[PDB]
Amino acid sequence: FPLQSYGFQPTVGYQPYRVVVLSFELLHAPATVCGPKKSTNLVKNKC
Amino acid sequence: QCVNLTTRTQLPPAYTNSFTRGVYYPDKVFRSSVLH
Structure with missing residues (x-):
């Protein structure tokens, strides 16, 4: 049988933990998600 | 609800x-204008 289960019970080193992997691909496309930053009016012909 | 078409002709x-x-x-x- 290929699987083995966790033994959950109302019972420190073996307690369950919730794990999330939050990946990124920040270069391969136009950006679709951004942080809370405010835009400003673009200016031209000045450094 | 699939149909077996044994009528297919197989060739190299x-x-x-x-x-x-x-x-x-x-x-x-x-x-x-660049070679990459």
């Missing part, structure tokens, strides 16, 4: 030339 695969087609933009970056 044909072949042809490929010329130079099969090239695709490796990345979503704009490049101009």
Whole structure:
């Protein structure tokens, strides 16, 4: 049988933990998600 | 609800030339007048 289960019970080193992997691909496309930053009016012909 | 078409005629695969087609933009970056 290929699987083995966790033994959950109302019972420190073996307690369950919730794990999330939050990946990124920040270069391969136009950006679709951004942080809370405010835009400003673009200016031209000045450094 | 699938149909078995045993009427298919099986033959050795044909072949042809490929010329130079099969090239695709490796990345979503704009490049101009450059050898990459």
